[PDB]
Amino acid sequence: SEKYFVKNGQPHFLISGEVHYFRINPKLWRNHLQLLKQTGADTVSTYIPWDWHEIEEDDFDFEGKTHPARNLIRFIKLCKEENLDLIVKPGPYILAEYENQGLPSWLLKKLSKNAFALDENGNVISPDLVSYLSDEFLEYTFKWYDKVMPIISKHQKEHYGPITMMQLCNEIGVFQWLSGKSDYNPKVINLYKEFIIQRYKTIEKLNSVYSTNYNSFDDLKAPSGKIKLRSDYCAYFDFHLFFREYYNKYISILKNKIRSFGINIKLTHNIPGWIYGNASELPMLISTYSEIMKNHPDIIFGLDHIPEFVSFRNAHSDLACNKILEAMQPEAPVWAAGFQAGTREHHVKAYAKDLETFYIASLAHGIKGFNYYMFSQGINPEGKGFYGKTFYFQTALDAASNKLALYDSIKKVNRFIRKEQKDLLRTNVNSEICVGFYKPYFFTELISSQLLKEKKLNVEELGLYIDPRFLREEILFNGLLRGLQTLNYNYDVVDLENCDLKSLTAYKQLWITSAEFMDAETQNLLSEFVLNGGNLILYPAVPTLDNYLNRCEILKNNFGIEFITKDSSHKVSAFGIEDVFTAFSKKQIYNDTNSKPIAFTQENEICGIRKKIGKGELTILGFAFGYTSDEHLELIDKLVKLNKIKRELFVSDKDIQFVVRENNKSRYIFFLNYHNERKTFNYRKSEEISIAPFSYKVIKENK
Amino acid sequence: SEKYFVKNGQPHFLISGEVHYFRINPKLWRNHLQLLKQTGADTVSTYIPWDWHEIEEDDFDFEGKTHPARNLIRFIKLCKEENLDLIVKPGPYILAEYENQGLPSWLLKKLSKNAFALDENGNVISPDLVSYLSDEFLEYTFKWYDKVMPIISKHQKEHYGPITMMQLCNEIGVFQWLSGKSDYNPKVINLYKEFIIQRYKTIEKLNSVYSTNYNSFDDLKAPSGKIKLRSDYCAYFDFHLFFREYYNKYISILKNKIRSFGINIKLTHNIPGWIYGNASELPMLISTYSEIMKNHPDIIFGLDHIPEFVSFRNAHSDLACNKILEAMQPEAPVWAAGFQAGTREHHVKAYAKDLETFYIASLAHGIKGFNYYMFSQGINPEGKGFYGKTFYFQTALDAASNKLALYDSIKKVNRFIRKEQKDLLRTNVNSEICVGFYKPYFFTELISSQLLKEKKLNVEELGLYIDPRFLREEILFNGLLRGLQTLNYNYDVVDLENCDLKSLTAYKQLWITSAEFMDAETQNLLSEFVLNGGNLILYPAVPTLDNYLNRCEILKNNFGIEFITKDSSHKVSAFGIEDVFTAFSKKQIYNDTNSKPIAFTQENEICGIRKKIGKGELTILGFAFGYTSDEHLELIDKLVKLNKIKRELFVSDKDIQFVVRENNKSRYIFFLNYHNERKTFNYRKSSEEISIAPFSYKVIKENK
Ligand SMILES: OC[C@H]1NC[C@H](O)[C@@H](O)[C@@H]1O
Ligand SMILES: OC[C@H]1NC[C@H](O)[C@@H](O)[C@@H]1O
Ligand SMILES: [Ca+2]
Ligand SMILES: [Ca+2]
């Protein structure tokens, strides 16, 4: 049932350390590799920077002819000699605070204006930022691949060499995330038009969806600036779908070119999204890769986990991310390609004693492998560093291979993992709760994000009151998911797109955080789920619109729901819990025919009901609660207990988090103390223990 | 020397605890007051909520006639019986996680639209957000004061009651700030117009400053939407000056009303600005009080410190805020009207072990008094909680008066303070470094802030590149101030407005973080500072504009500086430090003339020089750095060492923070470990061994 890496036909915990050969004194390459191996790590990970090896146009150095740290061949030979597998990341983009993000200076100087990402006024966005499908950019990328890929091919695992995985580029679309700005290159806008024409066939079909009045596709302009009309919302929605297809076209081009050298190893890509030690935006980045993930079984996405600290302030970020990736990529292990080791930023401390707790929490939260980023600090050679001489701080090893405090923490965690991995990797949590992932609420990197200062999406201007980013961040991520983890209730996430009914029927409850819009397919899926005997929890809105904000009331009509939207005090009562804070004065007030009222406004109007539909049960709440009070945890607890779901343990201290992972034979209880307080507690199944601040205890049980 | 509170002409550390009588069973009021007093607290603090006591329009209960917890009179008499002084805070706003921020439900339903703060389109920003000088709002506020102020007056200290201080309203502008919109109410528009006419006298004069072509004052309106022209920037700048006079007018109206009741006690106000456990926007909000603090010597402002956690992530916020309050209120003690105790919200934990370290760091950082907020948890009666039934968590006492973990932390801190307050309050740190506080860089709450929904200020549109908010947040607050604290160099902050030359000459170094604009008066003061023998460190720009972005080259000409602004790599070399990352491509490029070049671009162009001018020294860096790399701390350290400024102690672990506070008689060494690491280090005065737990402190007293 579990997905995990395999070595020597056994469950293998992938333990990789990022070591940038091009940022380390080559005299000390062997020493770094031996210290990495001595932690019990099995793999080493590195970029192969285009700029570093194509030193001038068509002048390649992979042998240290011009600088000993250009000796990639020797670095590969050292990995083999020190029995480390190798992950290679040849770009073309590598990011990683390398000048020009790893693209050669000589390339950027000589490319035409046409090869750059362009703003809506035809201006160069950044002297760094190419257009991914620029003819010129891809021609030079191919010429780089023509030299680096035969080296990778020779040393790939399917030729019994050390190279087990290769990353394609780095964080495709990251610059559209960081800026909130799309590439308006005429070549991209032409691919957008083909996408639109392909999707709608005729201008009449598009007009009826968008409510536009184009005489042809020639009158259709790429969306830009603020959404003022529903037609603008429609155009931006399809512009977001277009970019997911665009990224799939870019990564497919690179992949086919890589496969042409007989490279048959696993390909990777990695997902950023952590901001100031929380990851509530990372699901938006996962959503940018939806079309790659449906079209490429053979590309494994991993997570760049950057918690910065380990406390109740971010305890919930890593589980939610792991759970959502698992929903989007169920056939591949969940693994952290960028697993924080040290800090990218000197002024943002990474404490060994924090990260050690995060490493063990990551095991409780289902991680199957990771790549310590950065295991080894780096020194940028000769003006190659974007931001300073030094690359990362408080790592396992400094750039000179000095052991730092994190080294002993990684050795301790790695020893536990190696000891347990055969049982641990085959354990799962028993989840009787499923939480829906509705991808369209996440498709807003160009109009609404924590990185966009100026919002282009203001739902009030469209006659709506539930913002999909507020819903997915405060009601879902920081709300329900945070609530369930705090209450020590196991949950799974499911991708609602082309979701199989049978895969929902395993759960005692499905929870859906709904805005006022939801496509017919999902409305239909949830209708069938309940009618066939599923228990559905839905809030804060029964949807009445589809993704284009055209009328779609399938779920409402199938469930016999009638409501009016009315203003009331922010607080409601729900299941006899008084003073439940809700986010909106506007609430759905339900007709209660054939329904049990279970929630009331201050004026005693009915803003939540329970009813039987077919063989199933429906709980709808016409109001938005996250987790900003103890009443919110009481409400989540009452809802879970409607279907008599139980925690795996009774723990005396409610502020101790636990995860029970088991298979037929083995049980692991992970206790996690996210608080600055020594806690003593006892536990028993549904026996006294002390945990230091910001710390952990793992207890094993043979069943 | 030091500002501190006194009682019987002795240094007294003000120790208050916040106890909301309205949120506690009145049968337990005495038990809360006794337990507060047993910690060594001398004072109890509370809101008197308008909504709680005017139960319906013109129906008042201060005696517990309709609800026992409405017996304000009995609470006042218990404070007297239990020998606590009382701070009262009757609003009209209290915030306090109370429904409608403490304003009565019946008021907000009764008020016409023009009582409310309105956006640019004339719509109500928020149903509990009033326009402060609304005739209707002040009418009902006055009727509330008519009933509560006679009780307060009767129970003052001078009439043998316990009431020693009263807060006027609550964090003026906080509600407007949190809404992310500014107030365009027609009262604001009309008062702005009168302000502009008073300021310019003739349309010709305003046109000469703004570069506009108005025919009359009737053509001009309060600026709205985004700044596109320098004339728009000018209009917003005067709009910021106007809002400072407007907040002065609000608190003047409340103050004159209160005085009319024979209330002679000390009046207070409280400063907002912490959010998510940092305070980089607090200086902006304190700047909105500039006209109050110039006009009201007798109103003592205190800080509302909400750290939430205590780590290197926020170590610098409390010190910078204390220093900035001192710069703006130099004749009163620095004190915390709100001194975090527990958490206002369940999902944001407050640990006794964090907060105990914060209390000790606050002593190190020069705090002279505080009010633990909340000392006592409360339960909201009658659905009065904004966010839920329970008011605060992880406090010193639960609502029932049980001691929680924090109680023992507060007892330990207060015992230290009462044992030492006679010396400690008279101690100073030895600051050889002064940092300039240039208030106009902070005047952006209408156009640019972390909370403001619209970005109205893009300096690039005005042909500028140094954004004043980026400068004050990243180069000053999170940059220089953070760097100096991390490096264990003492600094003072001085308000440059009307600043006395005499008060700058005490320092070895004056540091100015400058944008491209600075008024003639400040340009002249820094000129005279250096000519008379001051040592000036100025970056990232020689300013050449005044506050209206018109030409002002006083400083540039007085310092004999020639520069061109050019693009280069972000990276510079400075003082032999390579790969110093700077925030802007554009840098100032200086001539060689009569100067030592000490910083260079990737093209080896001169972007920093040192020179002797008159009796003084000038270091100018034509580039912006905060603290986002190890190179930045190395650069700050190099600049401090230019004038041989030394740390008080050699400490073997650079990540240990210390403060040495001393007077003639006593030395206190504070060690602060802001890191999740047990640290064993040695130290000596410029060797003793110390082990310090994570997120912990040591205090050593020496008799000299
Ligand atoms: O938000 C916490 C606390 N900050 C300070 C405010 O004045 C007070 O009303 C509030 O309860
Ligand atoms: O956290 C934001 C804001 N909340 C309200 C508090 O009273 C204020 O002091 C604080 O700055
Ligand atoms: Ca799982
Ligand atoms: Ca019905």
Residue numbers in the entry:
A (entry chain B): 6 to 691, 700 to 716
B (entry chain A): 6 to 691, 699 to 716
From the article:
In order to understand the binding modes of ligands, the complex structures of WT with glucose (Glc) and Sop2 and the complex of the E343G mutant with 1-deoxynojirimycin (DNJ) were determined. c The E343G mutant was used for the complex with DNJ. The electron densities of DNJ molecules were observed only in subunit A in the E343G mutant. The DNJ molecules are located at subsites −1 and +1 like Sop2 in the WT-Sop2 complex. The DNJ molecule at subsite +1 is well superimposed with the corresponding moiety in the WT-Sop2 complex. In contrast, the position of the other DNJ molecule shifts to a little below from the corresponding distorted Glc moiety (3H2 conformation, φ = 322.034°, θ = 125.390°, Q = 0.532, according to the Cremer–Pople parameter calculator) of the WT-Sop2 complex at subsite −1. This is probably due to pushing up of the anomeric area by the Glu343 side chain, because the potential distance between the side chain oxygen atom in the carboxy group of Glu343 and the carbon atom corresponding to an anomeric one in the DNJ molecule is too close (1.3 Å). The absence of the side chain of the residue in the E343G mutant enables accommodation of the DNJ molecule without distortion (4C1 conformation, φ = 145.774°, θ = 4.556°, Q = 0.579). The potentially too close distance between the DNJ molecule at subsite −1 and the Glu343 side chain suggests that an α-anomeric configuration of a Glc molecule is not allowed at subsite −1.
The IALB_1185 protein, which is encoded in the gene cluster for endo-β-1,2-glucanase homologs in the genome of Ignavibacterium album, is a glycoside hydrolase family (GH) 35 protein. Here, we showed using recombinant IALB_1185 that this protein has glycosyltransferase activity toward β-1,2-glucooligosaccharides, and that the kinetic parameters for β-1,2-glucooligosaccharides are not within the ranges for general GH enzymes. Kinetic analysis further revealed that the enzyme has wide aglycone specificity regardless of the anomer, and that the β-1,2-linked glucose dimer sophorose is an appropriate donor. We propose that IALB_1185 be redefined β-1,2-glucooligosaccharide:d-glucoside β-d-glucosyltransferase as a systematic name and β-1,2-glucosyltransferase as an accepted name.
